[PDB]
Amino acid sequence: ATGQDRVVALVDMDCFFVQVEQRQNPHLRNKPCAVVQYKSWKGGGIIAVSYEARAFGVTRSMWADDAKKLCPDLLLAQVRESRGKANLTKYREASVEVMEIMSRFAVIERASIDEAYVDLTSAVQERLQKLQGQPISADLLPSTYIEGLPQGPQKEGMRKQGLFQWLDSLQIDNLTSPDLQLTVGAVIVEEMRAAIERETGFQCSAGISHNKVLAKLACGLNKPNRQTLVSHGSVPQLFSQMPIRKIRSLGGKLGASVIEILGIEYMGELTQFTESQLQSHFGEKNGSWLYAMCRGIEHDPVKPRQLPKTIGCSKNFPGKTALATREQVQWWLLQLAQELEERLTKDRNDNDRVATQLVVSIRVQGDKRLSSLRRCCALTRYDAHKMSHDAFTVIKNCNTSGIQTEWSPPLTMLFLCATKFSAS
DNA sequence: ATCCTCACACT
DNA sequence: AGTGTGAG
Ligand SMILES: O=c1[nH]cnc2c1ncn2[C@@H]1O[C@H](COP(=O)(O)OP(=O)(O)OP(=O)(O)O)[C@@H](O)[C@H]1O
Ligand SMILES: [Ca+2]
Numbered sequence: 001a002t003g004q005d006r007v008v009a010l011v012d013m014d015c016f017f018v019q020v021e022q023r024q025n026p027h028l029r030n031k032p033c034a035v036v037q038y039k040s041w042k043g044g045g046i047i048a049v050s051y052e053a054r055a056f057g058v059t060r061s062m063w064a065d066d067a068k069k070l071c072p073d074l075l076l077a078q079v080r081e082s083r084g085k086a087n088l089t090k091y092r093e094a095s096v097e098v099m100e101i102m103s104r105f106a107v108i109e110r111a112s113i114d115e116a117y118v119d120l121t122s123a124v125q126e127r128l129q130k131l132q133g134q135p136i137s138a139d140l141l142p143s144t145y146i147e148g149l150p151q152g153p154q155k156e157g158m159r160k161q162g163l164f165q166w167l168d169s170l171q172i173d174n175l176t177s178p179d180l181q182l183t184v185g186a187v188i189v190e191e192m193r194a195a196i197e198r199e200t201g202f203q204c205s206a207g208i209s210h211n212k213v214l215a216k217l218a219c220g221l222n223k224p225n226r227q228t229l230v231s232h233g234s235v236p237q238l239f240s241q242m243p244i245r246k247i248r249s250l251g252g253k254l255g256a257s258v259i260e261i262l263g264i265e266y267m268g269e270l271t272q273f274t275e276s277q278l279q280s281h282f283g284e285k286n287g288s289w290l291y292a293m294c295r296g297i298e299h300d301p302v303k304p305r306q307l308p309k310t311i312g313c314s315k316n317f318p319g320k321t322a323l324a325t326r327e328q329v330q331w332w333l334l335q336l337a338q339e340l341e342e343r344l345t346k347d348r349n350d351n352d353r354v355a356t357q358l359v360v361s362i363r364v365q366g367d368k369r370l371s372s373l374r375r376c377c378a379l380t381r382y383d384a385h386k387m388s389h390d391a392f393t394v395i396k397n398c399n400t401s402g403i404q405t406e407w408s409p410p411l412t413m414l415f416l417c418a419t420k421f422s423a424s
Numbered sequence: 425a426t427c428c429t430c431a432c433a434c435t
Numbered sequence: 436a437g438t439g440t441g442a443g
C-alpha cells in the first residue's frame with residue numbers, strides 16, 4: 001500500500017486580498033503594497049502583502065506603521081468597515097469567482113477563502129484514454145516544477161531541465177502508472193490555472209501529488225504563480241530535511257511533542273519507529289497517521305464541499321477598549337447580530353438552507369484562551385434584534401458584577417455563530 | 425493590540 | 436453540549 005491511488009491538487013491564490021485590490025485599482029499593480037484593517041491603532045493591521053513588499057520584510061500581522069519602517073514606499077489598500085468591523089465581502093465574492101471556475105474541471109473542496117483541494121483522479125483517467133498513448137509535451141506544462149529534479153551528471157532554465165528529465169523517463173504506455181497520472185493531473189491544473197487567470201485576472205500557485213498533505217506542501221515549494229508536482233518517489237529526499245512543523249497539522253503542540261519526545265527534527269526521521277511505538281507516544285489515531293504520513297501516505301478524502309458549514313461573526317476589543325457597560329455589550333452584540341442576519345439571509349437564498357442553532361461566546365479580560373465560554377440557544381428567525389437579545393440572555397449571567405448597568409469582568413471578545421443547517 | 429473565519433477531536 | 440487544537 002504505497003498511497004498512490006489518487007491524484008490530488010491544492011490550489012492557493014497568491015497574496016489573495018492584494019490581488020483583489022490590485023485588479024480593482026490599477027495604480028497598485030506591480031508595486032509593494034499591502035491590505036490593512038483598522039487604521040487607527042498603529043496604522044492598521046496588515047492582512048495581506050504583495051511579493052514586492054515581502055522583499056522588504058513586510059509580513060502579515062505587522063502594524064502598517066511598522067511595515068512603513070521596512071518599506072517606506074509601501075502602498076496600502078484598506079478593507080471595508082461596516083458596523084465597526086472589517087467586512088470581507090469583496091474578497092468572499094472574488095473567491096466565489098475562482099471556485100466556480102475550478103468546479104468546471106473537478107469537484108472541489110473549499111479549504112479557506114483562497115484555497116481549494118481538487119480530486120483529479122477521474123479527470124486524469126478520462127484524459128489518459130483521450131491521449132491514445134502519445135507523449136506529454138513540455139509545452140503542456142509551462143509553469144510546472146518537478147520536485148527533486150534536475151539531478152545527476154537561471155531559475156527558468158532549471159525548471160525546464162527538471163521537467164525534461166521527468167518527461168524523458170515517463171512510461172506513457174502504462175495507463176495505471178502513478179507518475180503518469182500525476183503528470184496528466186499537472187496538465188489539467190495548468191489548464192485550470194490558465195482559466196482562472198483569463199477569467200478573473202488572478203494568479204495562483206498549486207501543488208499536485210497523491211494526497212492533500214503532499215499537495216499542500218508541494219504548492220508552497222515554488223510560489224508565486226507556479227505549480228509543483230511531488231511524486232511518491234520524491235518523498236524520501238524531500239522529507240529527509242523537512243522540518244516536522246511544515247506538514248499540515250504538525251505546526252502546533254502535537255508537532256512540538258513529536259520533536260521533543262522522539263528527539264528528531266525532520267519528517268523522514270519518523271520512518272525508523274514502528275507504528276505501535278508512535279501510537280504509544282501520540283495515541284492510536286495520531287500514531288497511525290504519523291506512521292503512514294512520513295512514508296508519504298495519507299487518506300483524508302477531498303470532500304465534495306464547496307461552501308462552509310458554520311457562519312460566525314466575532315469582534316475583539318483589546319486593551320482599554322474592552323467592553324465594561326451593559327449597553328456597550330448590547331450594542332456590539334447587536335452589530336454582530338446584524339451582519340450575521342445579513343450573511344444568513346444571503347445563505348438562505350443562494351444556498352437553500354436554514355441555520356437552526358445560535359452559539360454565543362465571550363472572552364473576559366484576564367483569561368488566557370481564545371474563548372472563555374460557549375453557550376448555545378435556538379436560532380429560528382433571521383432577525384438581528386432577537387438574536388442579539390437571545391445572545392445577551394445566554395451570557396447575562398456571566399456578569400459577576402452586582403450592578404445591573406455595569407459589566408465585570410470586562411469583555412475582550414464577543415462571538416455569534418449560526419450552526420446546524422437544514423435544507424431549504 | 426493580530427484579528428477574524430472555519431473545521432474537527434475529545435469528553 | 437462545552438473545550439481545546441490547528442489552519443488560512
Ligand atoms: O493568521 C491569520 N489570521 C487571520 N486570517 C488569516 C490568517 N492567516 C491567513 N489568514 C486568512 O487567509 C487568507 C489567505 O491567507 P494565505 O496564508 O494564503 O496568504 P496570502 O494569500 O495573502 O499569501 P500567499 O498565499 O501568497 O502566502 C488571508 O488573506 C486571510 O484572509
Ligand atoms: Ca494564498
